[PDB]
Design a binder for these strands. Structure first.
Lengths: 65, 65, 116, 100, 88, 271
RNA sequence: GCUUGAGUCUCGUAGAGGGGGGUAGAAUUCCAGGUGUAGCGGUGAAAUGCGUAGAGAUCUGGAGGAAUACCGGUGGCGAAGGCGGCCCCCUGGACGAAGACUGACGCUCAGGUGCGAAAGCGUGGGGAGCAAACAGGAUUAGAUACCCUGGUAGUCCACGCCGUAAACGAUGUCGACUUGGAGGUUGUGCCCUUGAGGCGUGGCUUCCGGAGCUAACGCGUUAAGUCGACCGCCUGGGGAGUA
């Protein structure tokens, strides 16, 4: 139940998939804050960060491939 | 949704399947649009979730023994 | 014949039938069997057993392809989707992985309102 | 004026032929008085899904301050330029430095 | 919206100093400037009913300030509607 | 735009006119006109070939540039004009070398706007390029079929063809009939829908409206005798026979295109 | 005159608030082809239906339309209706910190005006899925119903119109005061970030409960408690929200 955004100044970005690949599952789909801590504000900000990633193909929408 | 399951497996081991989505979305989206029951069912189950939290708070009893 | 090496095994498991089909790397069918064709017309084809019978009867007709190892890949819910894996294993196919492509709309079409 | 953050994915052949793209676009922002603050090109990266089949594109980042006429230059060139596959412009992001 | 640039322009134009920001004359000036800037964005889009409700509240509050001004100092009321071009 | 007329008179009750106050008001550019003597529907042999034509107001021919073969010279739209010969407003464009031409006014064109032909051109509405420089998905009009012929598709009001897919030498247009088709990639096609888009909401009100747009009355079949139409006769309102044109061939569903020579460009006939 | 109401300004914050325009991916359908075969589908069981003209299955390519999986949360925003992919443009409101400015500029409102889910209506497009009507199969004593297979309006877009809903916390709006407990969310000040922190205070907010109130159920600082101002409305049931 660690929110990396507790010490993460330079708030969530859509290029740091190095950090983003932890908030998803094997399938590529976002994880719930009730299971990964992640204060709701930063959970929403990283939700749209992951969505912008997916758009830039830095993350897959599904694991179909 | 996909696993190699190295042939020294002898197992199902597809707990990823029934742990991530497969039936949690499919058998409830297969039909039934209705546009309004999601909120009704949502707050029925959410009253039950807050009731679980109330159980966890007030779980101090005497066991009848 | 054509001595195909390896392949994938699609299990389209519905609420009524359980279609087993065997395909290859390129995605071309080599044979198939279904719990409705293997007998079990009706209330029995929506059972897990008829599904494994379909898997056995589809292990049939691919002995002529020398298919060595199978990538089982399933689809949809139902009584099958596990007994067909058991049977595709007990038929002597080296199940190299057990994946699925069971389709999930990202909230697309409206579904039928059936079943009152 | 605003601080947009432009990113665009260019086809790998025109990745062999990218630098003219950046040069022309920065020429637009220059000639329109804007100022560029990053050019963090990442080169040929592979795409998580097959985009416009022939995947494995080549990214470019700009993160520039300019007005909407400039950004129109960028975005119209992006659409009508057959090399670039999926640009995307954004808003402030407060023009930044390295560590992608 | 009235960017801080233009709102300081109006406060300087209509106020007793740069500190006088709450005067009725300067409030009316800001409301009129914003309404006149917004009427173009409404004659376009013609359907933004929530922003329209915002505009109605602006014009009604400017009406209230102008009534207060005409009740208090009729002379400044006259000069203000003259300088802003309201109620011809 | 579309103003309905008040019913001071039967026949004005139902009129709906299409005014375009931006149109020109006065005589047109003279050096681009010429007499257009009416035909009344009769070929060189004298006889009526297409019935229901003849009469109506007279009109002169506005020589509308179709080939658009002035490359690399930007032309400013001098004024919109009402062209009787046609469905779409024409525009009088002035080139930088002192030239004036009539073009089909696209949808978003205004007096004073600037258009340009040529392969170098931009992608405004009004620019005409070979359908090899035009992006795919772009919506073009005044399209050609043979490179340099002049322009033959999407000429009338509110019409456009859609370049759905380019493929080597052959650009595929979906045509406003909903008909796929292929044309040679070298064919010029100006960009953007054709103006006067509302030309389909005017309702003419009365019978004289057609009679001066140059139409004559359409006597039904069953109103004639047996000798004058396949339909026709009876002791009061009998049809009893499958509908047919006056010359025999069956109507109400009978496909008559048979070319066999331009079938290779037809990808999927309309439906 | 005055500042304690009401506003204006300077800095920011959170948001499915709004309108306009692009765009992405999954998925259903259709089209063309490849492989492949006698079944598919559907149900309680069936049958209509689809299939040897070779379907269902699997694969590739293409078209098109609607809604945005996960995030998702009695979470947020909005006056209410309602609003959830991402990106851009124009735009409203809320609220916090400190400081300044005006100086009662206020509250409530008959009539009036405006917004007002869904259905529905007119004009023009669009039409993938779903689906009134409709048709067939089945059930049944009958079955013009549920069920199944199809399927038109319609749902979609623009512009008008209607002006109703259980439009419902069945709770008019504004202000004051009156014990508490745990939450959620969004601000901010202070101290040691001394290391995922602790102490205050603003806003919105969900649940339990005290005094009180209530016919009871219950409401309970977001009152249905104690009051003040203005409005709407009721006066037995049916006839009738009808003539």
């Amino acid at each position: 139940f660690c929110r990396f955004t507790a010490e993460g100044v330079q708030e969530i970005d859509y290029k740091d998939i190095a950090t983003l690949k932890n908030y998803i599952t094997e399938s590529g789909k976002i994880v719930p804050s009730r299971i990964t801590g992640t204060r709701a504000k930063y959970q929403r900000q990283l939700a749209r960060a992951i969505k912008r990633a997916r758009y830039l193909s830095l993350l897959p929408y599904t694991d179909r491939h | 949704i996909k696993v190699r399951e190295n042939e020294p497996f002898d197992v199902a081991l597809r707990r990823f399947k029934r742990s991530c989505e497969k039936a949690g979305v499919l058998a409830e989206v297969r039909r039934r649009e209705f546009y309004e029951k999601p909120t009704t069912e949502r707050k029925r189950a959410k009253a039950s979730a807050v009731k679980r939290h109330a159980k966890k708070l007030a779980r101090e009893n005497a066991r009848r023994t | 014949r054509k001595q195909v090496s390896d392949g994938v095994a699609h299990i389209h498991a519905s609420f009524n039938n359980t279609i087993v089909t065997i395909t290859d790397r390129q995605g071309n069918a080599l044979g198939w069997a279904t719990a409705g064709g293997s007998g079990f017309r009706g209330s029995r084809k929506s059972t897990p057993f008829a599904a494994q019978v379909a898997a056995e009867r589809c292990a049939d007709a691919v002995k002529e392809y020398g298919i060595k190892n199978l990538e089982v890949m399933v689809k949809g819910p139902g009584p099958g989707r596990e007994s067909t894996i058991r049977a595709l294993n007990a038929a002597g196919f080296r199940i190299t992985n057990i994946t699925d492509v069971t389709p999930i709309p990202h909230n697309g079409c409206r579904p039928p309102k059936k079943r009152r | 004026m605003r601080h947009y953050e432009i990113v665009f994915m260019v086809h790998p052949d025109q990745s062999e032929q990218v630098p003219g793209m950046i040069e022309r676009y920065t020429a637009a922002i220059t000639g329109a008085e804007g100022k560029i603050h990053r050019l963090e090109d990442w080169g040929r990266r592979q795409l998580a899904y097959p985009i416009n089949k022939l995947h494995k594109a080549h990214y470019v980042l700009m993160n520039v301050e300019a007005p909407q006429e400039v950004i129109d230059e960028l975005e119209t060139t992006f659409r009508f330029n057959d090399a670039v596959i999926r640009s995307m412009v954004m808003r402030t992001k407060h023009a930044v430095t390295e560590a992608s | 919206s009235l960017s801080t640039e233009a709102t300081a322009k109006i406060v300087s134009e209509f106020g007793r100093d740069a500190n006088d920001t709450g005067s009725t004359e300067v409030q009316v000036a800001l409301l009129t400037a914003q309404i006149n800037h917004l009427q173009g964005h409404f004659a376009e889009h013609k359907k933004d009913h929530h922003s329209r409700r915002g505009l109605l509240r602006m014009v009604s509050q400017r009406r209230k300030l102008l009534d207060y001004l005409k009740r208090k100092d009729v002379a400044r009321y006259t000069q203000l509607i003259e300088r802003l071009g309201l109620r011809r | 735009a579309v103003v309905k007329c008040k019913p001071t008179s039967p026949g004005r009750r139902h009129v709906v006119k299409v005014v375009n106050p931006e149109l020109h008001k006065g005589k047109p550019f003279a050096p681009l006109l010429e007499k257009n003597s009416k035909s009344g529907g009769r070929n060189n042999n004298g006889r009526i070939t297409t019935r229901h034509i003849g009469g109506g107001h007279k009109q002169a021919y506005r020589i509308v540039d179709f080939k658009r073969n002035k490359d690399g010279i930007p032309a400013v739209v001098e004024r919109l004009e009402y062209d009787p010969n046609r469905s779409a407003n024409i525009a009088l464009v002035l080139y930088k070398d002192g030239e004036r031409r009539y073009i089909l006014a696209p949808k978003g064109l205004k007096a004073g706007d600037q258009i340009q032909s040529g392969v170098d051109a931009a992608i405004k509405p009004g620019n005409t390029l070979p359908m090899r420089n035009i992006p795919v998905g772009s919506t073009v009009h005044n399209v050609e079929m043979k490179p340099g012929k002049g322009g033959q598709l999407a000429r009338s009001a509110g019409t456009y063809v859609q370049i759905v897919a380019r493929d080597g030498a052959y650009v595929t247009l979906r045509l406003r009939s909903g008909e796929m088709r292929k044309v040679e990639a070298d064919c010029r096609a100006t960009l953007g829908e054709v103006g006067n888009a509302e030309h389909m909401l005017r309702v003419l009100g009365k019978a004289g409206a057609a009679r001066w747009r140059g139409v004559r009355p359409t006597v039904r079949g069953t109103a004639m005798n047996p000798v004058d139409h396949p339909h026709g006769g009876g002791e009061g309102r009998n049809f009893g026979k499958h509908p047919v044109t006056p010359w025999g061939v069956q109507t109400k569903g009978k496909k008559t295109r048979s070319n066999k020579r331009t079938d290779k460009f037809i990808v999927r006939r309309r439906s």
